[PDB]
Copies of this chain bind each other. A is one copy, B any other.
Amino acid sequence: KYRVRKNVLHLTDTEKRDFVRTVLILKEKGIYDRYIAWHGAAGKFHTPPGSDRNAAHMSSAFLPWHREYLLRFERDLQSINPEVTLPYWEWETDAQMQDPSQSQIWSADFMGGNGNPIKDFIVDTGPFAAGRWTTIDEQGNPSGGLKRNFGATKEAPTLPTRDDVLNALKITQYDTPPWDMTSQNSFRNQLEGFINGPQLHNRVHRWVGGQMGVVPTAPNDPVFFLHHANVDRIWAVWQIIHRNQNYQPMKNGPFGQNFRDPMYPWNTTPEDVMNHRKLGYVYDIEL
Protein backbone atom coordinates (compact mmCIF):
# COMPACT_ATOMS: atom_id res chain seq x y z
CA LYS A 1 0.00 0.00 0.00
CA TYR A 2 2.92 2.30 0.83
CA ARG A 3 5.07 2.42 -2.31
CA VAL A 4 3.70 4.18 -5.37
CA ARG A 5 4.76 3.08 -8.85
CA LYS A 6 4.32 5.97 -11.27
CA ASN A 7 3.87 6.34 -15.02
CA VAL A 8 7.30 7.10 -16.50
CA LEU A 9 5.87 10.08 -18.38
CA HIS A 10 4.46 11.43 -15.11
CA LEU A 11 7.87 11.44 -13.41
CA THR A 12 9.56 14.74 -12.59
CA ASP A 13 13.00 15.62 -13.96
CA THR A 14 14.40 14.91 -10.50
CA GLU A 15 12.54 11.60 -10.26
CA LYS A 16 13.85 10.52 -13.67
CA ARG A 17 17.36 11.52 -12.61
CA ASP A 18 17.24 9.71 -9.26
CA PHE A 19 15.96 6.44 -10.75
CA VAL A 20 18.68 6.37 -13.41
CA ARG A 21 21.42 7.14 -10.88
CA THR A 22 20.09 4.42 -8.58
CA VAL A 23 20.10 1.85 -11.40
CA LEU A 24 23.68 2.88 -12.25
CA ILE A 25 24.72 2.35 -8.63
CA LEU A 26 23.13 -1.13 -8.56
CA LYS A 27 25.09 -1.90 -11.73
CA GLU A 28 28.38 -0.63 -10.30
CA LYS A 29 27.97 -2.58 -7.06
CA GLY A 30 27.33 -5.81 -8.96
CA ILE A 31 23.72 -6.19 -7.81
CA TYR A 32 22.17 -5.54 -11.23
CA ASP A 33 23.90 -8.49 -12.91
CA ARG A 34 22.26 -10.84 -10.39
CA TYR A 35 18.90 -10.00 -11.97
CA ILE A 36 20.19 -10.54 -15.51
CA ALA A 37 21.56 -13.92 -14.40
CA TRP A 38 18.43 -14.88 -12.44
CA HIS A 39 16.28 -14.19 -15.50
CA GLY A 40 18.61 -16.15 -17.78
CA ALA A 41 18.82 -19.14 -15.44
CA ALA A 42 15.03 -19.38 -15.12
CA GLY A 43 14.70 -19.39 -18.90
CA LYS A 44 16.87 -22.51 -19.00
CA PHE A 45 14.90 -24.24 -16.25
CA HIS A 46 12.17 -26.25 -17.95
CA THR A 47 9.08 -27.51 -16.13
CA PRO A 48 9.35 -30.34 -16.77
CA PRO A 49 12.62 -30.87 -18.67
CA GLY A 50 11.86 -31.58 -22.33
CA SER A 51 8.81 -29.33 -22.51
CA ASP A 52 8.83 -25.75 -23.79
CA ARG A 53 7.69 -24.46 -20.41
CA ASN A 54 10.17 -22.71 -18.19
CA ALA A 55 10.25 -21.25 -14.72
CA ALA A 56 9.76 -17.68 -15.93
CA HIS A 57 8.06 -17.99 -19.32
CA MET A 58 5.61 -19.89 -21.52
CA SER A 59 3.59 -21.12 -18.54
CA SER A 60 1.42 -20.01 -15.62
CA ALA A 61 4.36 -18.87 -13.48
CA PHE A 62 5.18 -16.10 -15.98
CA LEU A 63 3.28 -13.36 -14.11
CA PRO A 64 4.07 -14.21 -10.47
CA TRP A 65 7.73 -14.93 -11.32
CA HIS A 66 8.23 -11.45 -12.75
CA ARG A 67 6.26 -9.82 -9.93
CA GLU A 68 8.69 -11.35 -7.42
CA TYR A 69 11.50 -10.38 -9.79
CA LEU A 70 10.42 -6.72 -9.79
CA LEU A 71 9.69 -6.81 -6.06
CA ARG A 72 13.24 -7.87 -5.20
CA PHE A 73 14.56 -5.33 -7.70
CA GLU A 74 12.52 -2.47 -6.24
CA ARG A 75 13.76 -3.43 -2.77
CA ASP A 76 17.34 -3.17 -4.03
CA LEU A 77 16.46 0.26 -5.45
CA GLN A 78 15.25 1.43 -2.07
CA SER A 79 18.32 0.15 -0.26
CA ILE A 80 20.22 2.77 -2.26
CA ASN A 81 17.58 5.50 -2.39
CA PRO A 82 14.36 5.10 -0.32
CA GLU A 83 12.62 7.77 -2.41
CA VAL A 84 13.01 5.72 -5.59
CA THR A 85 10.35 3.25 -6.71
CA LEU A 86 10.02 1.24 -9.92
CA PRO A 87 8.06 3.21 -12.54
CA TYR A 88 6.15 1.60 -15.43
CA TRP A 89 6.23 2.12 -19.20
CA GLU A 90 2.66 2.48 -20.47
CA TRP A 91 3.41 1.35 -23.98
CA GLU A 92 -0.14 1.06 -25.08
CA THR A 93 -0.36 4.86 -24.87
CA ASP A 94 2.90 5.35 -26.79
CA ALA A 95 1.38 3.16 -29.51
CA GLN A 96 -0.98 6.06 -30.23
CA MET A 97 2.00 8.06 -31.52
CA GLN A 98 3.03 8.38 -35.16
CA ASP A 99 6.58 7.72 -33.99
CA PRO A 100 6.73 6.04 -30.54
CA SER A 101 10.51 6.58 -30.54
CA GLN A 102 9.73 10.25 -29.89
CA SER A 103 8.21 9.35 -26.52
CA GLN A 104 9.89 11.07 -23.57
CA ILE A 105 10.88 7.70 -22.08
CA TRP A 106 13.58 7.51 -24.76
CA SER A 107 14.98 10.95 -23.89
CA ALA A 108 18.68 11.36 -23.06
CA ASP A 109 17.83 12.05 -19.41
CA PHE A 110 16.16 8.66 -18.92
CA MET A 111 16.44 5.49 -21.04
CA GLY A 112 18.24 7.04 -24.00
CA GLY A 113 17.19 6.61 -27.60
CA ASN A 114 17.08 4.03 -30.38
CA GLY A 115 20.16 2.18 -31.60
CA ASN A 116 22.41 3.86 -34.14
CA PRO A 117 22.13 2.12 -37.56
CA ILE A 118 25.59 3.41 -38.46
CA LYS A 119 27.01 1.77 -35.33
CA ASP A 120 25.26 -1.60 -35.71
CA PHE A 121 22.32 -0.32 -33.63
CA ILE A 122 24.44 0.34 -30.55
CA VAL A 123 22.72 2.82 -28.23
CA ASP A 124 24.93 5.92 -28.17
CA THR A 125 22.60 8.31 -26.34
CA GLY A 126 21.37 8.44 -22.75
CA PRO A 127 22.92 7.18 -19.48
CA PHE A 128 23.05 3.58 -20.70
CA ALA A 129 24.96 4.28 -23.91
CA ALA A 130 28.11 2.36 -24.89
CA GLY A 131 31.06 3.31 -22.70
CA ARG A 132 28.66 4.16 -19.89
CA TRP A 133 26.98 0.80 -19.44
CA THR A 134 28.47 -2.65 -19.96
CA THR A 135 26.37 -5.67 -20.90
CA ILE A 136 26.86 -9.43 -20.58
CA ASP A 137 25.96 -12.29 -22.92
CA GLU A 138 24.24 -15.67 -22.55
CA GLN A 139 27.36 -17.19 -20.97
CA GLY A 140 27.78 -14.40 -18.44
CA ASN A 141 30.73 -12.77 -20.19
CA PRO A 142 31.06 -9.04 -21.07
CA SER A 143 29.31 -7.94 -24.27
CA GLY A 144 29.72 -4.81 -26.38
CA GLY A 145 27.10 -2.49 -25.00
CA LEU A 146 23.38 -2.03 -25.25
CA LYS A 147 21.54 -2.37 -28.56
CA ARG A 148 18.06 -1.30 -29.66
CA ASN A 149 16.25 -1.44 -33.00
CA PHE A 150 12.69 -0.13 -32.68
CA GLY A 151 10.07 -2.02 -34.69
CA ALA A 152 12.59 -3.58 -37.07
CA THR A 153 11.09 -7.08 -37.16
CA LYS A 154 8.31 -8.08 -39.56
CA GLU A 155 6.36 -9.73 -36.74
CA ALA A 156 6.41 -6.76 -34.36
CA PRO A 157 6.55 -3.49 -36.34
CA THR A 158 4.36 -1.71 -33.78
CA LEU A 159 3.66 -1.47 -30.05
CA PRO A 160 0.55 -3.09 -28.52
CA THR A 161 -2.54 -0.87 -28.50
CA ARG A 162 -4.89 0.10 -25.67
CA ASP A 163 -7.53 -2.11 -27.31
CA ASP A 164 -5.16 -5.08 -27.07
CA VAL A 165 -4.94 -4.49 -23.31
CA LEU A 166 -8.70 -4.08 -22.87
CA ASN A 167 -9.40 -7.27 -24.83
CA ALA A 168 -6.89 -9.10 -22.62
CA LEU A 169 -8.57 -7.82 -19.45
CA LYS A 170 -11.85 -9.35 -20.68
CA ILE A 171 -10.52 -12.90 -20.34
CA THR A 172 -12.33 -14.78 -17.56
CA GLN A 173 -9.70 -17.42 -16.77
CA TYR A 174 -6.22 -16.66 -15.44
CA ASP A 175 -4.84 -19.66 -17.31
CA THR A 176 -5.99 -22.92 -18.92
CA PRO A 177 -4.54 -26.39 -19.64
CA PRO A 178 -2.05 -27.41 -20.75
CA TRP A 179 -0.57 -24.29 -19.09
CA ASP A 180 1.72 -23.38 -22.00
CA MET A 181 1.91 -21.36 -25.23
CA THR A 182 -1.15 -23.23 -26.53
CA SER A 183 -3.38 -22.13 -23.71
CA GLN A 184 -6.61 -20.55 -24.88
CA ASN A 185 -8.97 -18.30 -23.07
CA SER A 186 -6.01 -17.66 -20.81
CA PHE A 187 -5.31 -14.19 -19.56
CA ARG A 188 -1.77 -15.26 -18.68
CA ASN A 189 -1.01 -16.56 -22.17
CA GLN A 190 -2.77 -13.65 -23.85
CA LEU A 191 -0.98 -11.03 -21.74
CA GLU A 192 2.31 -12.88 -22.23
CA GLY A 193 1.60 -12.66 -25.93
CA PHE A 194 1.31 -16.09 -27.53
CA ILE A 195 -2.31 -15.70 -28.67
CA ASN A 196 -1.64 -15.03 -32.36
CA GLY A 197 1.80 -13.85 -31.28
CA PRO A 198 3.74 -11.83 -30.91
CA GLN A 199 1.28 -9.68 -28.95
CA LEU A 200 1.40 -7.53 -25.78
CA HIS A 201 4.36 -8.55 -23.58
CA ASN A 202 6.15 -10.61 -26.24
CA ARG A 203 5.51 -7.91 -28.83
CA VAL A 204 7.13 -5.17 -26.75
CA HIS A 205 10.29 -7.26 -26.36
CA ARG A 206 10.55 -7.87 -30.11
CA TRP A 207 9.65 -4.25 -30.86
CA VAL A 208 12.51 -2.82 -28.78
CA GLY A 209 14.92 -5.30 -30.34
CA GLY A 210 18.56 -5.56 -29.34
CA GLN A 211 19.09 -7.47 -26.10
CA MET A 212 15.39 -6.98 -25.28
CA GLY A 213 14.40 -9.17 -28.22
CA VAL A 214 16.40 -12.09 -26.86
CA VAL A 215 15.27 -13.93 -23.70
CA PRO A 216 18.62 -14.69 -21.99
CA THR A 217 19.88 -11.12 -22.52
CA ALA A 218 16.72 -8.99 -22.15
CA PRO A 219 17.36 -7.52 -18.67
CA ASN A 220 20.60 -5.93 -19.94
CA ASP A 221 18.29 -3.09 -20.96
CA PRO A 222 16.89 -1.17 -17.95
CA VAL A 223 13.63 -0.70 -19.87
CA PHE A 224 13.01 -4.42 -19.20
CA PHE A 225 11.91 -3.57 -15.67
CA LEU A 226 9.89 -0.60 -16.92
CA HIS A 227 8.18 -2.91 -19.41
CA HIS A 228 7.33 -5.59 -16.85
CA ALA A 229 6.20 -2.99 -14.32
CA ASN A 230 3.46 -2.20 -16.84
CA VAL A 231 2.74 -5.89 -17.35
CA ASP A 232 2.50 -6.32 -13.58
CA ARG A 233 0.16 -3.32 -13.50
CA ILE A 234 -2.16 -4.80 -16.12
CA TRP A 235 -2.22 -8.08 -14.18
CA ALA A 236 -3.10 -6.22 -10.97
CA VAL A 237 -5.94 -4.49 -12.82
CA TRP A 238 -7.24 -7.87 -14.03
CA GLN A 239 -7.17 -9.27 -10.49
CA ILE A 240 -9.27 -6.42 -9.07
CA ILE A 241 -11.75 -6.78 -11.94
CA HIS A 242 -11.98 -10.55 -11.56
CA ARG A 243 -11.77 -10.92 -7.75
CA ASN A 244 -13.79 -14.15 -7.89
CA GLN A 245 -11.01 -15.54 -10.08
CA ASN A 246 -7.78 -16.96 -8.67
CA TYR A 247 -4.42 -18.34 -9.85
CA GLN A 248 -4.30 -21.49 -11.98
CA PRO A 249 -3.28 -24.20 -11.74
CA MET A 250 -3.78 -24.83 -8.03
CA LYS A 251 -2.73 -28.47 -8.38
CA ASN A 252 -1.69 -31.16 -10.89
CA GLY A 253 0.22 -28.72 -13.08
CA PRO A 254 3.93 -29.18 -13.80
CA PHE A 255 6.16 -28.72 -10.74
CA GLY A 256 7.05 -25.05 -10.41
CA GLN A 257 3.79 -23.91 -11.98
CA ASN A 258 1.32 -24.68 -9.19
CA PHE A 259 -0.06 -22.20 -6.64
CA ARG A 260 2.27 -23.34 -3.84
CA ASP A 261 5.27 -24.58 -5.82
CA PRO A 262 8.59 -22.76 -5.42
CA MET A 263 9.50 -20.60 -8.41
CA TYR A 264 13.09 -21.26 -9.52
CA PRO A 265 15.53 -19.79 -8.75
CA TRP A 266 13.75 -18.85 -5.51
CA ASN A 267 11.63 -20.55 -2.86
CA THR A 268 8.96 -17.93 -3.49
CA THR A 269 5.57 -19.36 -4.47
CA PRO A 270 2.89 -17.74 -6.68
CA GLU A 271 0.66 -17.55 -3.58
CA ASP A 272 3.27 -15.39 -1.81
CA VAL A 273 2.86 -12.68 -4.46
CA MET A 274 -0.78 -12.97 -5.56
CA ASN A 275 -1.65 -9.84 -3.60
CA HIS A 276 0.61 -7.03 -4.80
CA ARG A 277 -0.67 -4.55 -2.21
CA LYS A 278 0.39 -7.01 0.49
CA LEU A 279 3.88 -6.83 -1.03
CA GLY A 280 3.98 -3.15 -0.09
CA TYR A 281 3.45 -1.32 -3.38
CA VAL A 282 0.67 0.23 -5.46
CA TYR A 283 0.38 1.71 -8.94
CA ASP A 284 -0.55 5.40 -9.17
CA ILE A 285 -3.79 4.60 -11.02
CA GLU A 286 -5.02 2.93 -7.82
CA LEU A 287 -4.93 6.26 -5.97
Contact = CB atoms under 8 A, between A and B. Distances in A.
Given A30-B255, A37-B44, A41-B41, A141 B49 contact: yes
A44 B140 contact: yes
A136 interface: yes
Nearest to A140: B44
Contact of A47 (B30, B50, B264, B265): B30
Contacts of A31: 255
A263 to B, nearest CB: 10
Contacts of A255: 29-31
A12 interface: no
Interface in A118-154: 134, 136, 139-142
A255 B26 CA distance: 11
Nearest to A254: B30
Given A29-B255, A30-B256, A50-B142, A265 B45 contact: no
A50 B136 CA distance: 9
A37 B31 CA distance: 20
A49 B264 contact: no
Interface string A193-213: 000000000000000000000
Contacts of A224: none
Nearest to A43: B140
A38 interface: yes
Given A37-B44, A41-B37, A255-B30, A49 B265 contact: no
B134 A49 contact: yes
Contact of A265 (B30, B139, B256, B265): B265
Interface of A: 29-31, 33-34, 37-38, 40-41, 44-50, 54, 134, 136, 139-142, 254-256, 262, 264-265
26 contacts: A29-B255, A30-B47, A30-B48, A30-B254, A30-B256, A33-B45, A33-B49, A34-B45, A34-B262, A34-B264, A37-B41, A37-B44, A37-B264, A38-B265, A40-B41, A41-B41, A41-B44, A41-B265, A44-B139, A45-B140, A49-B134, A49-B136, A49-B140, A50-B142, A54-B140, A265-B265
